């Protein structure tokens, strides 16, 4: 099985799972620890922001690849803003501070 780009889920902006659903590989927790074990800071940054979740990042990246410019414009993951709204939907005021 292989996936470059196709459909994703509803709640989250990450790719679907499986083969019958044309989906990508779950880059799990211990693989993130293995990339932290190297100096792979940029590989991990595209591994969890551009390739997976951030919608503006992935559309800009697809257009940047097909122009011939391997460069990522990262932004913030969508599932973290989902986390902010689920935490904030309690009586909890979680924010994002100064520039």
């Amino acid at each position: 099985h292989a996936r470059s780009t196709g459909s994703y889920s509803l709640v989250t902006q990450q790719p679907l799972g499986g083969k019958a659903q044309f989906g990508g590989q779950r880059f799990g927790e211990m693989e993130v620890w293995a990339l932290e074990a190297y100096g792979a800071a940029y590989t991990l940054q595209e591994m969890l922001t551009v390739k997976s979740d951030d919608v503006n990042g992935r559309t800009k990246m697809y257009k940047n690849i097909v122009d011939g410019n391997h460069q990522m414009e990262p932004g913030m993951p969508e599932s973290f803003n989902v986390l902010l709204k689920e935490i904030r939907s309690l009586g909890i005021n979680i924010e994002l501070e100064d520039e």
Partner: protein, 1335 residues
Amino acid sequence: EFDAIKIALASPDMIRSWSFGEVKKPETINYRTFKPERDGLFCARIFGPVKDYECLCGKYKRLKHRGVICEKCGVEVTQTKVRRERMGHIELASPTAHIWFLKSLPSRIGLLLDMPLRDIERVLYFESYVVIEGGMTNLERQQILTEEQYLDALEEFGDEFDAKMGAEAIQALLKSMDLEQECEQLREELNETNSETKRKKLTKRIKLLEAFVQSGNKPEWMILTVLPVLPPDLRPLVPLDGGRFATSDLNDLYRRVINRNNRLKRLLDLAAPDIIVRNEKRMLQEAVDALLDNGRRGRAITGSNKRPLKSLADMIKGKQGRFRQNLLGKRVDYSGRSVITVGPYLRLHQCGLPKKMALELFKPFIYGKLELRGLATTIKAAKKMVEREEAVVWDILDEVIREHPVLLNRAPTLHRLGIQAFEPVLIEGKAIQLHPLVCAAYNADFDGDQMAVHVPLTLEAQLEARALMMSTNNILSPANGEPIIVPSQDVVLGLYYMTRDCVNAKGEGMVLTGPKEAERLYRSGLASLHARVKVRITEYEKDANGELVAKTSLKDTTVGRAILWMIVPKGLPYSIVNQALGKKAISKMLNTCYRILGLKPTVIFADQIMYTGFAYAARSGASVGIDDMVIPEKKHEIISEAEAEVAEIQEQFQSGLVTAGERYNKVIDIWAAANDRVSKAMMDNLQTETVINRDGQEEKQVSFNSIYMMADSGARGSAAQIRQLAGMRGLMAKPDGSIIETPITANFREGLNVLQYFISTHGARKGLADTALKTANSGYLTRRLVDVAQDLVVTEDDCGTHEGIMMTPVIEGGDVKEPLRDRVLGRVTAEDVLKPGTADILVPRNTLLHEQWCDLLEENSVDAVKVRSVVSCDTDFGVCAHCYGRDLARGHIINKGEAIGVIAAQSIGEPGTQLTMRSSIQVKNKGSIKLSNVKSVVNSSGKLVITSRNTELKLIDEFGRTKESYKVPYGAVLAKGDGEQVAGGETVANWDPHTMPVITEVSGFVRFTDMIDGQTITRQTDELTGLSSLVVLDSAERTAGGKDLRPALKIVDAQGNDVLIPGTDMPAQYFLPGKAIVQLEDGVQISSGDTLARIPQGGLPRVADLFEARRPKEPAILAEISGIVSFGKETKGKRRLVITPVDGSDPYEEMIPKWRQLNVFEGERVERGDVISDGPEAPHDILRLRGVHAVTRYIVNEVQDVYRLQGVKINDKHIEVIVRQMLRKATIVNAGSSDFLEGEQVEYSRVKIANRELEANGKVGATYSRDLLGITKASLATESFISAASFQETTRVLTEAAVAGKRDELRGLKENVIVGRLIPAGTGYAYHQDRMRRR
């Protein structure tokens, strides 16, 4: 873009500021059409239009007026994702307190209003009343009231009196709670009391009272008044395949809260009576509490069928919340997965990758390449071209592959060598071809395994895959110094068959002018691959400074050793191939090649090793047959001699001469002896079976048996497995844990019958159950370790210290187990090591000890090295580059940046699978004696007896290093003395552990002081001997009239005056303990070394109990202060022990549980770190008593003992840094001139920078005290709540952070993996240097 994440409470004004409209109706959707509800949960005006830039109902179907809201639609006009960020709010009719601040253990409202949880819930569920500023009545403010208590009060205090209930009353209490006022009171209460329990109970209440005043969190924000609703997009309502909507659980929760709130508003309209609106508000309280955190209240609500439905807190917490399932691990585009296979033609920087996966993973690069050439125009055309797969896109694909690495990943990645980057080579096929040597890194066999491929998209990621994660760059395991590209199984058989010899072959003893014609004689058919031969080889030894000097000579060698010499690079000597080359020898061949010639010859030489091993293993034809497993001819007579022996033992058992346990022990002993004899018979019969003549009489050699080369080469097989295929397969054990007395005398070449196979299945089912349940604890151990580490990044170059732990070789009592060169390899010395002669600067004080320095250490026989350890590093927030050590997979020091906490945590937890889950001293060598911790005396006979319990007996050799060590008890008969030379095997120690010696220092006469027969001691004349002994009783058997009497022996002179201790003016009286029996009676003159009484008496969960720092059930008790010791009160729960120091203050004591067999007498002076009883010892006692270096030596030795018992090589840096992360918190003792509190627990780097910026001023600092937290308590007690929330319980940590108003200055690895940016360790450390500089 943004610094720290701030968490605080949500005010009702803040919740109305989040909101965009009140969600009234609970009606979800229409359900018969497609439209929602106006205005229900899924509204239009409150949130937004379903369709993008459209009024859902009807107006604006173009792009001109985005925003207009007509009365017929009551709809906003924006994007489809606008509803995902917009949230609604439910105006709760009746106030409802939060469940996270009422049941968090400890509750936030429980230790703030000074009221028990039980009483808080009673009033909260409309079952109890609470007073609130009554007035001039006889009632308190916190005191509650019941129906009867209120009824009577109602008729009594009908006027000025307030007694409400529920959240409303609670809210008022919190609202009317002067925070500041309580502070002073609490502070004054803590300074006006001495109660230990109260002190801790008051310090925990004042800590959460002053923390609330420090932030902008109000006391009335605990109760929920304006409940917030999560965005619809985040609670999606999609239908499955069919005609119904599979609705989420949160819609059930919100719809019930809104149904109940509408009912409660209508009842407060109608003025229903009291009990109706109490049940109505109570059902609303339980509905809100079920929405927020379901199931924390009594049994959780359920929709379909009996399974409870999932609430908001269950969208956060757990293995499947947002942290562990969508933020730490994500699903990933440009990724693939398939079954692996070998492909041995590869070079070790490249892997095979199928054409179909390659054309799917590289669709955008192919699109960009196709658009560059000009073959097509629009993007559609290119997608049709690769959907059709024409003849021109495969050249495009070979031009996008070429220099573009991919990340191969095996699915259980345990350490960092399980993600490696290759270059693709395209494969006709559907299976990833993976280079074989690399398999030993992935733990990848080829029995059905699968791997995932990931594509580095951007340019920095291609460079990170080539420069950090390439497979040529990972040739040493980061856990140690051992190479991980060791040749595994076929190739060592090909080498072991190639470089060997036989006593006659084709071309025996002919002479050859080079290795080239050695291979030419092997190929043409004129010699054999193993035929001993003088060749002329030219080995290049590089003895100058970087210059290779040729020396050519004639080596008496074989043909195969010359053929393998054609592949060895220049610098290695010929003697690396002159031996037989098993697996350990080829591993040290690649290791010496890496240490001498560097990286590139070692990569190309690893490939040439693998190619020539595969080729000559193919030419070998090394099969396995049924005749290869040679049965010993002596096996049947050994079994019959064992059968005669068990017959003799059972004939004694019929006549009852021997006991049953001694029978079972004798049967297990003779079957162990017969098993060892059968193994030696088959091992001789395999290791030297070949006996071939050469030009005359016969001559023997090691065998070319196939199973023996598979065992001796170390390819696959050991002694035990080849033992079970030929000799008997031992004594298998039943699942009771005890062994079975009748062994399995049949191997596998003979047939096992039925019972023997069933006993075998006992033994093997236990092993499969152990692995399949062991793997969960191994993985959870790696998780706890990488979440306690998680932060620690090499961030300096020198901390500027002179402290470091004292690396000695470790010695258990056998031969010296782990040499000093294994422990001080590549670790930077603390002070400069003196050469063992006299005062020489052998090595300087900041030199890395690589192999050349360690060889000059081994030549001089250096005792022990004071070396720098990670736990002694002075760097605030990180570890400096010298106190870590060598890079371990790079030859140099650790770079500024490389995350060492994560590689250390992986290197400790990765061998978690291989670990298991469930008289006197006899010297061995011949050397010199030395004693430490010794205070001794010469007895009458001459044997130096010892008056100290804790004496260490070292055996030092003639060179200076310490070769043996032992522990000698109090009062043992030493055959030798101090500084003496002995012989190998001579007994040097003797004692009796069943009889605790009460030996003396001086001589004289014996008097019975406080020894009265009848109450103190008893008369027990011996039965079978007649020589009686006055038996000393204990303090429990005698009655209360004489229980105060302490029996003792004090030595006098010939007159009767007390003979004093030499050095003091005190007599030497020995107080006899309980259960003693007097050996030497009254009037008998004594000497030293003679007793005065007879006193009769682990694998992987050990690693968990060392890092998590549990206490053992019966710890060894110690002394918190030095000085004289005494006893106390007679058995009220415990038996006291009072320690009065010589110069220090007296009042320390401890109540010992009296079930322990003590070690100390009444006239004994103790010390800190000195034992009082025996058994295991808790690490907190080591930390608060001996020192920090003592507890780090304790953990690294007690866990390298597990990792060495199971045989795993791990360097000690990793355990020292997880020990650093254990003892990172501290507690204050004297607050000093700072802003801390008395017994406040604060982290160590904070208090050290505080009193280091105050001590640089005039003010003297604060004196701390370090504390050792276990790894899950230490990773949950962090100054970064996302780090402590991605890990275990999120409810406790988020309420603690919310009511404290905590802020997360990100500054670690997992905060930046959550929030989606660069890691502040690796390549991103320059980015975080830049961002930290530009503030």
